């Protein structure tokens, strides 16, 4: 009987450890869930804004081309004036 | 002693269940870690490309400003020489 009781105590401590494992696993998993969601949202927003900037940059390219051509014209006019 | 043996076997099956729950949690943990690593790498790339785009937009904007002002001045001078 005493040997069996010793066995029981061992099983008790092992069950305790198992529940401990369960709790720590859950906590870490919830943490990583939070980080996952925040990272995903921020990634989405960052991609959106970067694409916006790209579009504006292309528009600026076209504007610059227009201005360059007009400056060429004015320069030719001025030199002929000279 | 008989009662104790009963409790011993019950705790034994409970311990096996505990071990299985532990392994399942472990696998979930590895999985979520993998996912988080991937998404964070994507975050790095997204932020960096955003920065590149923003810088280029800035530079093009400035150049546009300068050339536009020069063209305007030369236009005024063209009228003057008329």
């Amino acid at each position: 009987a005493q040997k069996d009781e010793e066995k029981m105590e061992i099983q008790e401590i092992q069950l305790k450890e198992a529940k401990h494992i369960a709790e720590d696993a859950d906590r870490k998993y919830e943490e990583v869930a939070r980080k996952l969601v925040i990272i995903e949202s921020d990634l989405e927003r960052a991609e959106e804004r970067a694409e916006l900037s790209e579009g504006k940059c292309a528009e600026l390219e076209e504007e610059l081309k227009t201005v360059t051509n007009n400056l060429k014209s004015l320069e030719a006019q001025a030199e002929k004036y000279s | 002693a008989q009662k104790d043996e009963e409790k011993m076997e019950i705790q034994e099956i409970q311990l096996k269940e505990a071990k299985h729950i532990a392994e399942d949690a472990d696998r979930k943990y590895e999985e979520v870690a993998r996912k988080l690593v991937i998404i964070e790498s994507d975050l790095e790339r997204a932020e960096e490309r955003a920065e590149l785009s923003e810088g280029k937009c800035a530079e093009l904007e400035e150049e546009l400003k300068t050339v536009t002002n020069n063209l305007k001045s030369l236009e005024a001078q063209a009228e003057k020489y008329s």
């Binding site: - | 392994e23 696998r27 590895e30 999985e31």
Partner: protein, 160 residues
Amino acid sequence: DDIYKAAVEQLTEEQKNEFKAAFDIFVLGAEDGCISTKELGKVMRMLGQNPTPEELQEMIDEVDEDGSGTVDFDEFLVMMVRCMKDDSKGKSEEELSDLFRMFDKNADGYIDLEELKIMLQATGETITEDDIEELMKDGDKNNDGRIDYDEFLEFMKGVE
């Protein structure tokens, strides 16, 4: 190909002990290899190997062709031996660099997918659906129109 049959011929008894333990675990008595998807992963993780859960999903999605869950022990043993990592780094990076130096007939700093096709044609082999398309597609995985040295390495990295 014949490599699976040869591996069956050279069955490593060290891994055969683990595979017979897997036999006993799966076969609960007069059982026809029902192929339990969770059992496959539990056995693979139990045997000390590091199976990617990607490969476990592969095993889930590529079994039981008869539709009744019964799978031949020959095929199951073949899958178990092959999915287990039995290779040594697939030659050396220096050897691969020397081979790529050999393969650069164009002498333009890299090789070409059609150059690989022509050279493999010179090897005197019949090309079929297993050949031709995916071989050249995966040679230039980044699809640059030419297979660079890094692409050459990544195509056959860790390959004997």
